[PDB]
């Protein structure tokens, strides 16, 4: 269902502290900004990452999306060490489960 695209626009990612920032337009009409920690539903699992599981950026490097061919979309993509000390490069795609109400930021 509907996803933080169209809703928001500047779609930003810091990649220390995984925050992704963007502007909202309320049913009020008025343009508000937004934070959200993905950590909270992301975790490391031996190498790989999902949904579900918390603290990734710990045990990943290089954190960075990527527009496709509309940049209504962006991708993540990170390296994630495995539990022998391997480093491995994973992907996921945040337009999903995931939605942003007209004034609030919640998942669906
Ligand atoms: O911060 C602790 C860390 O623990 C768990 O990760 C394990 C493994 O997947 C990691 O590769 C190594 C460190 O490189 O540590 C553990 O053995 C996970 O629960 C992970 O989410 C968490 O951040």
């Known amino acids: ?3 933080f695209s169209h809703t928001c626009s500047s779609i930003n990612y810091d ?3 995984t925050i992704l920032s963007a502007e909202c337009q309320a ?3 008025e343009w508000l900004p937004t ?3 993905l950590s909270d539903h992301i975790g490391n699992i031996d190498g790989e990452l999902q949904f579900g599981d918390q603290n990734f950026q710990e045990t990943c490097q290089d954190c960075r999306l990527e527009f496709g061919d509309g ?3 962006v991708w ?3 390296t994630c060490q495995t539990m022998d000390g ?3 490069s994973t992907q996921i795609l945040l337009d999903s489960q995931i ?3 007209d004034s609030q930021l919640e998942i669906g």
Do not use: A, T, Y
Request: proline share 8%.
């Open 15 to 17: 990649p220390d502290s």
């Open 71 to 73: 940049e209504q979309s």
């Open 35 to 37: 934070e959200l920690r």
């Open 76 to 78: 993540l993509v990170c």
């Open 86 to 88: 391997e480093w491995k």
């Open 99 to 101: 939605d942003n109400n």
């Open 27 to 29: 049913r009020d009409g």
């Open 1 to 3: 269902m509907p996803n």
